[PDB]
C-alpha cells in the first residue's frame, strides 16, 4: 500500500494549521485566473 505517514500533506504547521498566511502567498492565489 502506501510507504507514507504523510496524508495531512501540504498543510503546513506554522501557517495553514495556525490559520496564517505567508508573506507572498496571496500572489499565487491572485494568479488563479485573476482574483475577484
Amino acid at each position: 500500500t502506501f510507504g507514507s505517514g504523510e496524508a495531512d500533506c501540504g498543510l503546513r504547521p506554522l501557517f495553514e494549521k495556525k490559520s496564517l498566511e505567508d508573506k507572498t502567498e496571496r500572489e499565487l492565489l491572485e494568479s488563479y485566473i485573476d482574483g475577484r
Partner: protein, 259 residues
C-alpha cells in the same frame, strides 16, 4: 535562486537538503513526500558526462533546515538512505528527459513544525492548476548569480531562498532553447517585457516547484528543478520535471513493497 528572497521559517517544511558526505558539500535540494520517501532530480545523483555517480551511502539528507550552513540543533534531522531509484528511461545523454529519482530513507522521520510532506497532484489538480500564467514557488539553497563567470555579489545564500514565478506556455518554452523539450518538462519564469525577474540556478536542482490549491488549501508539488541555460537571462526560462506525468512511476515504486 536568483532574484528571490529569504524564506520565512517553516514555510517550506517539505524542503530537503541533499548533502554529500565527504567532502561535505551541498549538492541539490529535494522534497519530503512521505515519512520515508524523498523525491529529487536524477542528475543530482547520476550524470555520466560530468563523471557523476552517487550511491546510497555517499549522501546525507538534511530535513527541517533553513540555514545553509549551521547545524540547527533541535530542528534539523540528518537521515541516511536505504535505496535510490532513478527513472529507468531518464535520458542523461540528450535533454535530461525524465529527470526524477526517489530516495527511500533508512528509517522514518517524524513530522514536526519544520518537517512536513507536500502533496503530489492528481489528474484534476494537475489539469486545474497548471495553466500558463499561473504562478508557483521554487525554494533552494543554490546559486544567487552565475558563478562560472566573474560576477559581483555573493554566490551562495545563508538562508533558504523562495521565488514565486509563472508557468509559461510550451510555444515560448520551446523557442527559448535549442535543447529538445518534452512532455515531461515545463518551463516557468518572466518574459522580458513583464518587469519582474527571478529563476532557479545551479544548486537548486531537485527542489520543488509547488502550487497552493484554492480548493482544499494544500500545497502540491507540480515540478522538480531540472535544467536551465544560465540563470535569470532575458528570454530564457527554467525547466522543470513534470511531476504529474511521472506519477505512474512514482506510485509504482512507492507502493511496490509493504511496510
Amino acid at each position: 535562486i536568483v532574484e528571490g528572497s529569504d524564506a520565512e521559517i517553516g514555510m517550506s517544511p517539505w524542503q530537503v537538503m541533499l548533502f554529500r558526505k565527504s567532502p561535505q558539500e551541498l549538492l541539490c535540494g529535494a522534497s519530503l513526500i512521505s515519512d520515508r520517501w524523498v523525491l529529487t532530480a536524477a542528475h543530482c545523483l547520476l550524470y555520466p558526462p560530468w563523471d557523476k555517480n552517487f550511491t546510497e551511502n555517499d549522501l546525507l539528507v538534511r530535513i527541517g533546515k533553513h540555514s545553509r550552513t549551521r547545524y540547527e540543533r533541535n530542528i534539523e534531522k540528518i537521515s541516511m538512505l536505504e535505496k535510490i531509484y532513478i527513472h529507468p528511461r531518464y535520458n542523461w545523454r540528450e535533454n535530461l528527459d525524465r529527470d526524477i529519482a526517489l530516495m527511500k530513507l533508512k528509517k522514518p522521520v517524524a513530522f514536526s513544525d519544520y518537517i512536513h510532506p507536500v502533496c503530489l497532484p492528481d489528474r484534476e489538480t494537475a489539469a486545474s492548476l497548471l495553466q500558463a500564467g499561473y504562478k508557483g514557488r521554487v525554494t533552494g539553497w543554490g546559486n544567487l548569480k552565475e558563478t562560472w563567470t566573474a560576477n559581483v555579489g555573493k554566490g551562495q545564500p545563508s538562508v533558504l531562498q523562495v521565488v514565486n514565478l509563472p508557468i509559461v506556455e510550451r510555444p515560448v518554452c520551446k523557442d527559448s532553447t535549442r535543447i529538445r523539450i518534452t512532455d515531461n518538462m515545463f518551463c516557468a519564469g518572466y518574459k522580458p517585457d513583464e518587469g519582474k525577474r527571478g529563476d532557479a540556478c545551479e544548486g537548486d536542482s531537485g527542489g520543488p516547484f509547488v502550487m497552493k490549491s484554492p480548493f482544499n488549501n494544500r500545497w502540491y508539488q507540480m515540478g522538480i528543478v531540472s535544467w536551465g541555460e544560465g540563470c535569470d537571462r532575458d528570454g530564457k526560462y527554467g525547466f522543470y520535471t513534470h511531476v504529474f506525468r511521472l506519477k505512474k512511476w512514482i506510485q509504482k515504486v512507492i507502493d511496490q513493497f509493504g511496510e
